[PDB]
Amino acid sequence: SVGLIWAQSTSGVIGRDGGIPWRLPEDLAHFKRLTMGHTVVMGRRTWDSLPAAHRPLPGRRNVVVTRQTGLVAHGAQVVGSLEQALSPAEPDAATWVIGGAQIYALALPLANRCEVTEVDVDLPPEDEDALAPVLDQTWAGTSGEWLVSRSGLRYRMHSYRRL
Ligand SMILES: NC(=O)c1ccc[n+]([C@@H]2O[C@H](COP(=O)([O-])OP(=O)(O)OC[C@H]3O[C@@H](n4cnc5c(N)ncnc54)[C@H](OP(=O)(O)O)[C@@H]3O)[C@@H](O)[C@H]2O)c1
Ligand SMILES: Nc1nc(N)c(OCCCOc2ccccc2CCC(=O)O)c(-c2cccc(C(F)(F)F)c2)n1
Numbered sequence: 001s002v003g004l005i006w007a008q009s010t011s012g013v014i015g016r017d018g019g020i021p022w023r024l025p026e027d028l029a030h031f032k033r034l035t036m037g038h039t040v041v042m043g044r045r046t047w048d049s050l051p052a053a054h055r056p057l058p059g060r061r062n063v064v065v066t067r068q069t070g071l072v073a074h075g076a077q078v079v080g081s082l083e084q085a086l087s088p089a090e091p092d093a094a095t096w097v098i099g100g101a102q103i104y105a106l107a108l109p110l111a112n113r114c115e116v117t118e119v120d121v122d123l124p125p126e127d128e129d130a131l132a133p134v135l136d137q138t139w140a141g142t143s144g145e146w147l148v149s150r151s152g153l154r155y156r157m158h159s160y161r162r163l
């Protein structure tokens, strides 16, 4: 099973200025809970975005997709395409594609599940933003309730599966 997992603003923004343009501890916890013990596949720019205490992501097999064959990525496995990332020598029962926008677009046709956090925050898109994929009629989903973060932001989780 190949799943995508992302958090987006209402407007679809997932990334800005090399990071994520809001804070939501409850979503970071959700991400850690769903991915721990599994393979996490990410694009090189997402690898570059991980803070030092979170690089590599602990307790997960980190796989980084790049065209730069000689990339130095200590703690991760470097691969040259998304297809390579999804064709491990050691299979994993659960593989999660964890971003960013470029890799989500490539992974969506190969995936059967998306776990999406919607964040109740108004962020008009800016020119260099990374944006979430859009789920068409081949996907169907179920929504959790609106939840209130300690910080004040509200958020809700959606679980989509391929029809
Ligand atoms: N909110 C969320 O849930 C979430 C999750 C993850 C990331 N983010 C944010 O998203 C942003 C990063 O996303 P992004 O779209 O800019 O980058 P990205 O998808 O993480 O990485 C793009 C890189 O992947 C590699 N790549 C792309 N297509 C490839 C292909 N066909 N074959 C081989 N390598 C390929 C290239 O690496 P090379 O240039 O090295 O060749 C490319 O520069 C950051 O702001 C990050 O904080 C948000
Ligand atoms: N639902 C979902 N899916 C994602 N693919 C996702 O990004 C995963 C790659 C980025 O990871 C990190 C970035 C900065 C610090 C720590 C981590 C992971 C540390 C770990 O997991 O040990 C996120 C995510 C991650 C961090 C913060 C937010 C925010 F700001 F929205 F709250 C969202 N959330």
Ligand SMILES: [Br-]
Pocket: 023, 024, 025, 028
């Ligand atoms: Br956070």
